Ligand binder design. Sequence first.
Ligand SMILES: *C/C=C(C)/C=C/C=C(C)/C=C/C1=C(C)CCCC1(C)C
Ligand SMILES: *C/C=C(C)/C=C/C=C(C)/C=C/C1=C(C)CCCC1(C)C
Ligand SMILES: *C/C=C(C)/C=C/C=C(C)/C=C/C1=C(C)CCCC1(C)C
Lengths: 217, 217, 217
Amino acid sequence: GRPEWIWLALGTALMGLGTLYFLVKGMGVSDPDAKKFYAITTLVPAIAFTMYLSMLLGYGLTMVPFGGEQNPIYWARYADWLFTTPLLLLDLALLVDADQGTILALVGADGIMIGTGLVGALTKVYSYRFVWWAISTAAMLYILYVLFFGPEVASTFKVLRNVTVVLWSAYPVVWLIGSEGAGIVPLNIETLLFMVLDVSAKVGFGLILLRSRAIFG
Amino acid sequence: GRPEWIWLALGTALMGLGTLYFLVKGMGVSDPDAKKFYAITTLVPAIAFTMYLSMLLGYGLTMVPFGGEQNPIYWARYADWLFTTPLLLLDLALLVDADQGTILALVGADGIMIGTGLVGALTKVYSYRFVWWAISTAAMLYILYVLFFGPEVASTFKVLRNVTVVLWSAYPVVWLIGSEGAGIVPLNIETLLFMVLDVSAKVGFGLILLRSRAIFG
Amino acid sequence: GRPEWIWLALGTALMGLGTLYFLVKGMGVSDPDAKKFYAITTLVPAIAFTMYLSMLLGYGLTMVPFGGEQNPIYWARYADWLFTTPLLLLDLALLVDADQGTILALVGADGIMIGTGLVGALTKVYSYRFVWWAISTAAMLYILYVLFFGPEVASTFKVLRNVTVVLWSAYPVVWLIGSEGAGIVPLNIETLLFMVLDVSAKVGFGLILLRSRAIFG
Ligand SMILES: *C/C=C(C)/C=C/C=C(C)/C=C/C1=C(C)CCCC1(C)C
Ligand SMILES: *C/C=C(C)/C=C/C=C(C)/C=C/C1=C(C)CCCC1(C)C
Ligand SMILES: *C/C=C(C)/C=C/C=C(C)/C=C/C1=C(C)CCCC1(C)C
């Protein structure tokens, strides 16, 4: 029905498989630290899976009036990211044994990032949408700042940090030019971009982490 | 007005009394571990109380169109379970000194279980409701799996585990045959079943736990 | 447009500045304990800032029918308080090294306090609104009870405790006489009162705490 459906179906499938793979891979792990990383990393795509399914079936989709039109907004993404983005930061923070003050800063900022993103997404005054985008972006930049200025461990963290910064930074650009923002890129193509980003930031990120010896004490 | 009102009133009352009883019972406890179990166990029915009240007054009730009808759906249950089910798992996990990786797995899975349950409850495409029910059930079965394959302590945990598995497993069956699912059992009877299950899984479970010497260090 | 706009604008500004001040002030802190207090205390007004902005732009405002009228209800306050009030309790609890059982009690009770407040705010049956207000108030009184009956540290905690009790206690009175309750005080004046309370309980509270040597190990 909706041209973006194929990407949602493929997104659902790839999150589903990634979840199952990490579930299997994690069986037999007894190391307490390793358990933590498997739990976090498996839960990410499991949640993403349910929200991709939500969007595919049309449950995670609403219409937001602005700019003199009914704009199709997939709210289910913010429900996803609200839980998955903090968990991904938690993998990075636990990897470097970050202290609780820094964890709370990252989680807090993340919560704000997604929350303002959501408000932006559903705002009916076109111009205001972008005020929310700017605040959320500030919060993202704060997160990237902490990650950078807040041997196997070092090495794996550096790789996952670089992966994070490049992928996460693309989301505000996609949002801004997409159907939630300027509407210069059509929803179908926006949906494809977000699937590639999400699968890379969840399953891609997850394969790198769970194959490393850093997760083990 | 609504025939199920009596069960909601009785549910409200019994959660209310259970909360007060556990509040009193917990006064004077100085043991740090015991405090944790009293806090968790008292908070469960306190939350359940407010949501039963919500449903009784009609605040926690919405109409969901599907199958060519306006179906009365008490959404307030998912608001309740979203917080109470994780807390009940937290009692069990703390009882056996489970590690944080296992706690996060259980909490995560629980969140998914209830979240998908909620989406199912509010889904307007009849057939899709059951896709959500199946996912949520998978998550429940994962939880039951971890509880089983993930002396006073051992003994009390075994009793509370068995209580949990039997009561929790009935919820998907009640949902499936109830007004949220197949609609072969009328809402009034469905409401009665859920009250008996909820009071047994919260106050019943809570009496067993708070009377045990396992809670003490 | 709305006469209360000036207070929302001023509220937004003052939370914004407080956030920036605490962000700057916190740079260079290396002490793990101090980090925790800076993270918590900076995040409070940051969240408050976004919700004040929400209300100013009109996003955090809905109309609730009751008493034969369309009543303008700023729901964005409960979204704010839901996260900021627990964080403020967390500052106090960490200050006195409270145990996890007490933290969970305070957080739990807080969650209930705000949650019932929200339900009250949006309830369409006028008389029921006040049942919810009474429950939420009970939860508040429980919180105040725990704070009181549950040298620099002692001294700073006593000052912040006294600040908390006096400011927090005014909220139910403002709600009750305001546009959410009895409607004897007009929304503009209610909005002013809440701004003064919020800025005092967040920035005021935050200046006292972050200037103390108690935050340091
Ligand atoms: C699995 C999903 C991931 C890792 C998603 C990350 C999402 C972001 C970093 C989104 C950022 C946004 C902004 C900074 C501006 C406002 C719009 C958002 C929410 C797309
Ligand atoms: C106090 C409440 C308790 C212990 C409730 C537990 C609820 C469940 C285990 C519900 C499970 C469900 C499924 C597995 C399938 C989908 C429908 C649900 C949410 C009823
Ligand atoms: C930054 C905000 C703060 C510290 C707000 C605290 C809010 C309260 C203590 C609100 C309490 C309420 C009641 C006890 C009764 C019901 C209405 C409420 C939610 C206003």
